[PDB]
Ligand binder design. Sequence first.
Ligand code: MYA
Ligand code: 8RD
Ligand code: CL
Length: 385
Amino acid sequence: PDYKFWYTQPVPKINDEFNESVNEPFISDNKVEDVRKDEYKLPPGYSWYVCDVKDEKDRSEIYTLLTDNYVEDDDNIFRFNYSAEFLLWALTSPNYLKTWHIGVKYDASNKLIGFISAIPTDICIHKRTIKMAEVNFLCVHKTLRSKRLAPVLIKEITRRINLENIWQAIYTAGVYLPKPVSDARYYHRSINVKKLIEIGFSSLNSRLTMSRAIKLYRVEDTLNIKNMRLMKKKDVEGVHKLLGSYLEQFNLYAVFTKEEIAHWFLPIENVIYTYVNEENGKIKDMISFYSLPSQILGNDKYSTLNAAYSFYNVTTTATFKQLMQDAILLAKRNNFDVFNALEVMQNKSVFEDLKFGEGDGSLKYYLYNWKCASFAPAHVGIVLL
Ligand SMILES: CCCCCCCCCCCCCC(=O)SCCNC(=O)CCNC(=O)[C@H](O)C(C)(C)COP(=O)(O)OP(=O)(O)OC[C@H]1O[C@@H](n2cnc3c(N)ncnc32)[C@H](O)[C@@H]1OP(=O)(O)O
Ligand SMILES: CNCc1nnc2ccc(-c3ccc(F)cc3OCCc3c(C(=O)N4CCOCC4)nn(C)c3C)cn12
Ligand SMILES: [Cl-]
């Protein structure tokens, strides 16, 4: 309601509205020379720590911080449990900066209690392509909440990003902040029906008994696209063209280089899954989803919901519904308990037919130091991890 920190930032106020003809920074003509070279002050006993995510132990420290203190669902059934290998993948995209992986340590115990990260990427917003920082994994230890640490983390990473002559950022959050460019409800498609019911996430009733639910969400183990296969390095050029052509229709997408295609789509077990359909030497269809377990809080039987998240999907030889049906089948074949997707790109058009259930909240999309018209989530063409 007050937004005492955010109203000091170059972001729209809660009731700011810009028309289609506006697509520019809040603050332009920025000079790297003018960026502060001193780190932001922390409370005494706390220190900045540049994390080396390629070091296993530094990476484990981030993993522990997030495992115990990161995002929980609105009902506190779940907490995200990003794997250490996933964090490596998420944070070492091409041209990434290790100095954008910022930790705060409590000196007395030498333990990480705060973290924020960013990676650089070209973001096309309303047909204008801007080098941006993609901010993610902001986390403050549960014991230090509501002490205004997050503004310090946000301001410090803003400074480090500005030092690289980058003045815009993209980020997402479940909380409402000034001010979303788009707002995206999330949906789920049950796969391990019995498990989702036992943990308390899915519901039954007289019409949907346990056995009828199991039958309803059972899938045929046959791809609509017969030759969908795991992506290999030979497909990077093909995927780059297919996805790149698909994404230009949207109001907000990342302009991937081939190097970025290789990093973000070549498969890593329990991290990122991409399947392709090659015809006549061309990649004509692609499915991708990443692995993001939710820890199941307090649950005696299960400690982990193995969830797959829809990443990027393009079809030219099938319908989008058949493609996503295959996406669900491919996630099941890989032992995921649930398939999750946002109402971005074409996704909403298949949610009813493919038996998705609507979730309880939404993911908001944001830009930093950019004013433009907002848009319905079907015009969003980017998924942040
Ligand atoms: C050009 C370069 C630009 C780079 C910067 C681009 C912007 C990047 C911004 C970051 C993108 C992150 C993307 C993701 O990672 S989204 C993931 C966010 N992380 C979690 O939800 C994990 C669980 N929660 C926590 O760890 C803490 O609660 C956090 C760290 C979230 C808040 O800490 P705490 O609870 O101890 O509060 P405080 O007293 O320190 O801070 C209070 C202030 O913080 C504002 N707040 C609350 N939640 C968020 C949020 N998700 N994004 C931005 N701001 C947020 C809040 O409105 C208030 O400001 P104001 O209301 O008074 O104004
Ligand atoms: C974007 N960067 C990370 C990030 N930051 N904030 C958020 C908020 C939402 C989401 C989110 C995004 C897409 C999606 F499709 C579902 C999503 O969230 C489901 C709610 C949920 C669940 C959950 O209900 N489930 C059951 C089904 O399987 C998955 C786990 N668990 N948690 C821990 C959450 C937050 C990501 N967010
Ligand atoms: Cl098959």
